Ligand binder design. Sequence first.
Ligand SMILES: OC[C@H]1O[C@H](O[C@H]2[C@H](O)[C@@H](O)[C@@H](O[C@H]3[C@H](O)[C@@H](O)[C@@H](O[C@H]4[C@H](O)[C@@H](O)[C@@H](O[C@H]5[C@H](O)[C@@H](O)[C@@H](O)O[C@@H]5CO)O[C@@H]4CO)O[C@@H]3CO)O[C@@H]2CO)[C@H](O)[C@@H](O)[C@@H]1O
Length: 476
Amino acid sequence: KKLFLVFWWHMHQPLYREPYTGEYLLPWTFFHAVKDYYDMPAYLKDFEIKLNFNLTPVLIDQIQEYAQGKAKDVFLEAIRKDPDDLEKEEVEKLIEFTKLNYEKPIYRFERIRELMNKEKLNREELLDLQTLNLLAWCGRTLRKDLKDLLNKGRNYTQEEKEYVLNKYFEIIKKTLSIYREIKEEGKGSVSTSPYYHPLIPILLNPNCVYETTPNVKIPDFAVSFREDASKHVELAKEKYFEIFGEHPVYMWPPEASVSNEALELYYEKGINMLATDEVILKNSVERASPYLRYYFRELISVFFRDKTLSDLIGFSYHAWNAEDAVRDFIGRLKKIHESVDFQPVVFVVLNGENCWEYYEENGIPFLEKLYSTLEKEEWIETLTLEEAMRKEDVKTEVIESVKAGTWFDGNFLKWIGNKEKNEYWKILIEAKKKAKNDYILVAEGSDWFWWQGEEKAPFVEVFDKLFRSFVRRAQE
Ligand SMILES: OC[C@H]1O[C@H](O[C@H]2[C@H](O)[C@@H](O)[C@@H](O[C@H]3[C@H](O)[C@@H](O)[C@@H](O[C@H]4[C@H](O)[C@@H](O)[C@@H](O[C@H]5[C@H](O)[C@@H](O)[C@@H](O)O[C@@H]5CO)O[C@@H]4CO)O[C@@H]3CO)O[C@@H]2CO)[C@H](O)[C@@H](O)[C@@H]1O
């Protein structure tokens, strides 16, 4: 009697490329590409398990731009330059980027503490600041190859910095290939999301927010976003088809966000399976076990992720030592395995690139120990999404209706309902009336609304510049 375990790592970045200048205004796609987007599937080279991935189309666009050498990344340019050529504005951004990241485990170099305590940096100190910011984001593959440069920890030269940069771009250039390979080998399924990661239930019917938060104030949606919701899904099918050669039959709904209308749209667009969050399940049915495969109105298959297991990796186990964390995770799977006399399906679904920076050594000890243990446990079978979709020896149930929500408390409050987030929607609504191109779809991404009306400086001014630039460009 097996326990079926399904990892589904979601990868996404909003579009950081300013439409007028073409400049990538933040380096987050570059840094997660070199740290996570290649290395997370590359674990499948060394471990005989199945792992699944979601790639948003807007992320794929950016990965391709960096791989082709076309991305003009302003923070990266400040890294690459000889410090004698740095603008004062570039030295300032270098220091602010360091201070934002200072306390993360992947930044635990004694030298960074030294450099942040100095009143002013000479050329050698700036070279160490640039190169340590680079090396802090080193992924698993190159942490082996560049181990000696990493251990050095100080006194970096321009040549060593450029060497690291060349190896990083080699990693980016191989990134789409590794997703194609693990897919062709049956080592994992690859899904996508509606193109720019929007809140599909809101675009289809903004009133769905009242199913969970009736007291929320939302602006006057004086224009229809229903066609745009279709276009996000349709364009995403086309981008996936270009990259992987087939139309996707699995999709990750952004923010796990579903509604009756959204599920109908995915079904209409040929999606056969998605996943969403256990809170939505609890809100929608009485007996809310997440270990069943659900069928929404016999139209589309829906799995509900195990929220506690997903949150343990996503948020808890950074605060644990790696071995203890793996023992805790396996022990919880044991309890699930023992708690039912059927074969449970256990979906572990979370962002695949954001939690590791808070783990010791970028989560590599944790994931290596976790996957090594999993590959040898005889009562656990890890599945591709395709295997989980067609598994016959599991329990099954039909659901007729869901309560609209997201994996954030089962509601939409992180993207709508306060004055500053509502202002973004009002701006989008007014721009949509006059929109003339697909940059309006870019501005519909959830990321812009997530950061608006929050304390989270800095670079929130940069997300604001991006959103409003996309809104302006959509009208021309
Ligand atoms: O204030 C409390 C809060 O603030 C601080 O967070 C800061 C981060 O620690 C800091 O690094 C920076 O956050 C960056 C982030 O590091 C960077 O990668 C980028 O974030 C990307 C994600 O990487 C990307 O995956 C995507 O995330 C989506 C996600 O895919 C989706 O499934 C869902 O979960 O929504 C996410 C957001 O839309 O996109 C984002 C960009 O939108 O940019 C971030 C912002 O610069 O800055 C944060 C402070 O401003 C604390 O340190 C943090 O721990 C606290 O919780």
